[PDB]
């Protein structure tokens, strides 16, 4: 509904890390929410954006889009400020239709969640080896 | 690793609704590994496909793609066989770098899972409330 701080704990690899996201305001040109972590430098921090197609009279079909990115930076020699070395993206796009009931929409979201913890995707993402 | 019969339990809007996925073989042309459900009709069954980028000596980016799509169909009047009326899609595309370590990929994957279970995105998907 109304976005506020989002706290994630015991996140992965070894459960040693935590992540607190603070709301960063809804973009008014295309309705994209934003969240970010309180980092040292604004140019390098973990960001999340959630976009939901607005309700209208008819619409073709709805869309939910989540898009995260985590930049890793290093202090290069001969420079005084960190520069973003690289970053890993990720995004998920749901494409429900007009007549989709609540139960089946809530089935896809937690089927994806329960599948990202299965051994198959653990091996497919952590070590990057196909099936 | 070698794909097996993935069973997902305790999923869907509440409580328990198991879902046993059986492997459907790799596609040689593009390398997508398919999974499916033991349905009575082959065209009325949920399926998921994973696709990890093939490791090469000079590949300066990797890309994992998981694509769930499940149909729901009612017995159309005037015919003896059911026909697909609508279906729900969901695809996620990770995009790492040639130099990304395991601590980054595991972080991204578990962050996405915890966000899928977050109290914001659950309502943004179930009730389609914009944030």
């Amino acid at each position, epitope marked *: 509904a109304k976005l506020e701080t989002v*706290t*994630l*704990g*015991n*996140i*992965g690899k*070894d*459960g*040693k890390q*935590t992540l*607190v996201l603070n709301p960063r305001g809804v973009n008014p040109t295309n309705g994209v929410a934003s969240l970010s972590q309180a980092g040292a430098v604004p140019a390098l921090e973990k960001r999340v954006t959630v976009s939901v197609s607005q309700p209208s009279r008819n619409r073709k079909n709805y869309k939910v889009q989540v898009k995260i990115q985590n930049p890793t930076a290093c202090t290069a020699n001969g420079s005084c400020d960190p520069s973003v070395t690289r970053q890993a993206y990720a995004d998920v796009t749901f494409s429900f239709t007009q007549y989709s009931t609540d139960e089946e929409r809530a089935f896809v979201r*937690t089927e994806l*969640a*329960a599948l*990202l*913890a*299965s*051994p198959l995707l*653990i091996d497919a993402i952590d070590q990057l080896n196909p099936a | 690793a070698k794909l097996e019969t993935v069973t997902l*339990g*305790n*999923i869907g809007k509440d409580g328990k609704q198991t879902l046993v996925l059986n492997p459907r073989g790799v596609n040689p042309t593009n390398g997508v590994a398919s999974l499916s459900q033991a349905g009575a009709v082959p065209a009325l069954e949920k399926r998921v496909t994973v696709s990890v980028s093939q490791p090469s000596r000079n590949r300066k980016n990797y890309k994992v793609q998981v694509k769930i799509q499940n149909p729901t169909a009612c017995t159309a009047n005037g015919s003896c066989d059911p026909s697909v009326t609508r279906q729900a899609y969901a695809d996620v595309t990770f995009s790492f770098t040639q130099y990304s370590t395991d601590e980054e990929r595991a972080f991204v994957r*578990t962050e996405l*899972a*915890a966000l899928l*279970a977050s109290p914001l995105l659950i309502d943004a998907i179930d009730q389609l409330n914009p944030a």
Partner: antibody
Amino acid sequence: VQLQQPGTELVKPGASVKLSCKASGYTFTSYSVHWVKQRPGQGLEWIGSINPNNDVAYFNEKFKTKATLTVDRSSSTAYMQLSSLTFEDSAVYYCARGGIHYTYDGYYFDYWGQGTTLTV
Amino acid sequence: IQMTQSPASLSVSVGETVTLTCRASENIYSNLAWYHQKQGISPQLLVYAAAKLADGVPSRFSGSGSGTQYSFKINSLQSEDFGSYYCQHFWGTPWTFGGGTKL
């Protein structure tokens, strides 16, 4: 739903017996299993924990080089090693299930089984 | 993150409400447990989020907490509520438990 784990075990210092905890009534491969160590007159410790499926292990720093734990899906059992035992190890070892295999919010131990009361 | 609990003994006879706190060191958010054990048997869960009753325990235990300071209280002490209540945090990995306060 019930977790059972003998009553008593005795080793002598140097040896290393593996504690077992059998869980019945809740479809074992869906909830992670946690191990907690209680001294006879002090507080709890939380040795470590794993979940039955995908076998990810969460360890305490102190017990990383002393205990390893595994699962047996066929018999639905959880095993814990304690690879080396000294004199200051006689305690009570509880196995409790808490959580679920795909969420990182609920991890509260709710269904503790009885102890073992190791003696060295 | 190390949790430091508050008075361990608290004495108190069975005629009054009792209130205790379990401080946190580095602002754990509202996710901690309130285990209870009677000596000789395994512990039991009472409050499983901060203010939520766990399964069926009677609604005479109540918890509440700030960003970094949480409290647990009982309305009628009754004869059974003894045995060094414990608190545990689930923010990081260590899940260090608390000191434990007898009654």
